[PDB]
Design a protein around this ligand. Structure first.
Ligand SMILES: CCCCCCCCCCCCCCCCCC(=O)SCCNC(=O)CCNC(=O)[C@H](O)C(C)(C)COP(=O)(O)OP(=O)(O)OC[C@H]1O[C@@H](n2cnc3c(N)ncnc32)[C@H](O)[C@@H]1OP(=O)(O)O
Ligand SMILES: CCCCCCCCCCCCO[C@@H]1O[C@H](CO)[C@@H](O[C@H]2O[C@H](CO)[C@@H](O)[C@H](O)[C@H]2O)[C@H](O)[C@H]1O
Ligand SMILES: [Zn+2]
Ligand SMILES: [Zn+2]
Length: 298
């Protein structure tokens, strides 16, 4: 389609943008309601804590093992049962559907740190964290991102399926269902069942991944590639469920781990390896220490 060159031309390094006010209000309201959910933590029952933490991890795996490694990068291959687990988990996590998530991410890698990068870190921290979700995509994103080969995803039935039935699926998996089962099973109050079991954990999962774009691209160390910007960040690797070794991963995206070392702080590699031993994941790419050593070259 088209674009307005007033939102593309810039004297400096950042053009003007169109504020999406539907998103600004909703994001603000999710976080305000999350801050309130923090204050309701000591009130909560023990089970809803376990429920909250548990729901956090599965949601993470739906993005980490699922949306990112399996589908965005095609690092490994997953048998049908695991496929179902990850696609359901990805709906629990309510980031954009696997198709759109991978599409943006395949551009995040190939056009890293340009205006074709959906979360361009050159724009700043706030933009890369959540700011890019509060504004219209810079024209270059779909101008250059229309290049990418998304055939592997389009041909995958399950991926396109959740893309269609996403609004119902995400409503259930991310809001209704995670609110009902504390309020109904271990007699949680509806108020805590809302602002903690859903509001708090969903906001937690959001930022935890946002730090992989924001925090991880400005803070850390680069023993693999000095010239690029993603950093090896331990906290982010711990915040995320393993995706914080970003200087490594942008250098080796097809790695079925996101790091040089398996299981180090990679809870997912451990998970994926468990899935492999069960016979549910099978084609793991592991980059030779040869190539990793051949790249101190940066
Ligand atoms: C917990 C541990 C897990 C750790 C994870 C570790 C991950 C490691 C690696 C880091 C990966 C980055 C993480 C990503 C996480 C962010 C996901 C969320 O926050 S989401 C949470 C929920 N928050 C939300 O959902 C916020 C809602 N988002 C929005 O409202 C908009 O996207 C907008 C506000 C950003 C402006 O967007 P706007 O410019 O107005 O237009 P639209 O965008 O709507 O689409 C325009 C059309 O052009 C095309 N096109 C677009 N992009 C591309 C592309 N790259 N290419 C090609 N084409 C592209 C396309 O055809 C499209 O049509 P269609 O696709 O519909 O067919
Ligand atoms: O000044 C402005 O500099 C910006 C910085 O990206 C250029 O930005 C451009 O980037 C790419 C190509 O590089 C184009 O696909 C995009 O549509 C445009 O925004 C503008 O074309 C120019 O008008
Ligand atoms: Zn990145
Ligand atoms: Zn990646």
């Amino acid at each position: 389609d088209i674009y307005d060159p007033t939102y593309a031309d810039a004297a400096g390094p950042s053009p003007k943008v169109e504020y999406v006010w539907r998103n600004i209000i909703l994001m603000s309201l999710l976080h305000l309601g999350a801050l309130y959910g923090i204050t309701l933590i000591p009130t909560c029952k023990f089970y809803t804590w376990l429920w909250g933490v548990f729901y956090y991890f599965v949601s993470a795996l739906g993005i980490t093992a699922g949306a990112h490694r399996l589908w965005s990068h095609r690092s490994y291959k997953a048998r049908l049962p695991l496929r179902l687990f990850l696609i359901i988990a990805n709906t629990m996590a309510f980031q954009n559907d696997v198709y759109e998530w991978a599409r943006d991410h395949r551009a995040h890698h190939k056009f890293s740190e340009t205006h074709a990068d959906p979360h361009n870190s050159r724009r700043g921290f706030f933009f890369s964290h959540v700011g890019w979700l509060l504004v219209r995509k810079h024209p270059a994103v779909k101008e250059k991102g229309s290049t990418l080969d998304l055939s592997d995803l389009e041909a995958e039935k399950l991926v396109m399926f959740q893309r269609r039935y996403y609004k119902p699926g995400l409503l259930m998996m991310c809001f209704i269902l995670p609110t009902l089962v504390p309020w109904y099973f271990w007699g949680e109050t509806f108020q805590n069942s809302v602002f903690v079991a859903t509001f708090l954990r969903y906001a937690v999962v959001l930022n935890a991944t946002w730090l992989v774009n924001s925090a991880a691209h400005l803070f850390g160390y680069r023993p693999y590639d000095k010239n690029i910007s993603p950093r090896e960040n331990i906290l982010v690797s711990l915040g995320a469920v393993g995706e914080g070794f970003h200087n490594y991963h942008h250098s080796f995206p097809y790695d079925y781990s996101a790091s040089e070392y398996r299981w180090h702080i990679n809870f997912t590699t451990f998970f994926i390896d468990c899935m492999a031993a069960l016979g549910l994941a099978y084609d793991r790419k592991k980059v030779s220490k040869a190539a990793i050593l051949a790249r101190i070259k940066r």
